[PDB]
C-alpha cells in the first residue's frame, strides 16, 4: 500500500484527501503515467469543476501558474503527481 | 548540440520554433528541470502573452486541457518539454 507524501499544497484539506484517494484509485487501475494522470484529472473535473491538469511521473520539474486554492503536488509511493487548475 | 524532436503540436510553426529556441537557451543556462521549465514559461508569457505552463523532465505522463493553437510537446535531446496555455 502506497505512502502519500504531500510536498506542496494550496488546497483545502478535504480536496487534498480526495486527490490522494483519486490517485490511489488510479494506480490500482492503471500502470501508464498518462492514464493515471487522465483518471485523476477527469475525477477532479467532475468532483470539483473544470479545468484541471495533471502530470504524473518519476522525473520532471515544472513551472505552472495555478488558481489559488487549487494546487497540489504530492507523491504516492514512488510516483509524483501534480494536479492544479490554471490561474 | 541537442536534437529537437517535436512529438505533438497544436501551435504555429513560428511559435514551435521559438519554443525550441527558448528551450535551447534554457538548457544552456540551467541544469535543473524546474529552472529550465521556469525560463521557458516566462519567455513565452512575455513573447506570446500569459498564461503558459511548462513541464520539463525525462519521465512523466500528463493529461492537460489546452487552448487550441497553444500546445507543444517535444524533446530537446533526452529531455521532454510540455508547454501550453490552459483551455
Amino acid at each position: 500500500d502506497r505512502k502519500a507524501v504531500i510536498k506542496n499544497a494550496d488546497m483545502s484539506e478535504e480536496m487534498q484527501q480526495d486527490a490522494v484517494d483519486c490517485a490511489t484509485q488510479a494506480l490500482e487501475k492503471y500502470n501508464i503515467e498518462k492514464d493515471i494522470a487522465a483518471y485523476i484529472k477527469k475525477e477532479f473535473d467532475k468532483k470539483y469543476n473544470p479545468t484541471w491538469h495533471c502530470i504524473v511521473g518519476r522525473n520532471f520539474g515544472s513551472y505552472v501558474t495555478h488558481e489559488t486554492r487549487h494546487f497540489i503536488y504530492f507523491y504516492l509511493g514512488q510516483v509524483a503527481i501534480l494536479l492544479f487548475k490554471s490561474g | 548540440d541537442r536534437k529537437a524532436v517535436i512529438k505533438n503540436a497544436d501551435m504555429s510553426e513560428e511559435m514551435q520554433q521559438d519554443a525550441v529556441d527558448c528551450a535551447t537557451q534554457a538548457l544552456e543556462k540551467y541544469n535543473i528541470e524546474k529552472d529550465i521549465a521556469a525560463y521557458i514559461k516566462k519567455e513565452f508569457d512575455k513573447k506570446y502573452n500569459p498564461t503558459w505552463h511548462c513541464i520539463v523532465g525525462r519521465n512523466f505522463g500528463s493529461y492537460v486541457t489546452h487552448e487550441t493553437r497553444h500546445f507543444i510537446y517535444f524533446y530537446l535531446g533526452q529531455v521532454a518539454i510540455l508547454l501550453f496555455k490552459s483551455g
Partner: peptide, 9 residues
C-alpha cells in the same frame, strides 16, 4: 500564483 515543482528523483 506561479510555483515550481521538482521531483526528488
Amino acid at each position: 500564483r506561479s510555483t515550481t515543482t521538482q521531483t526528488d528523483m
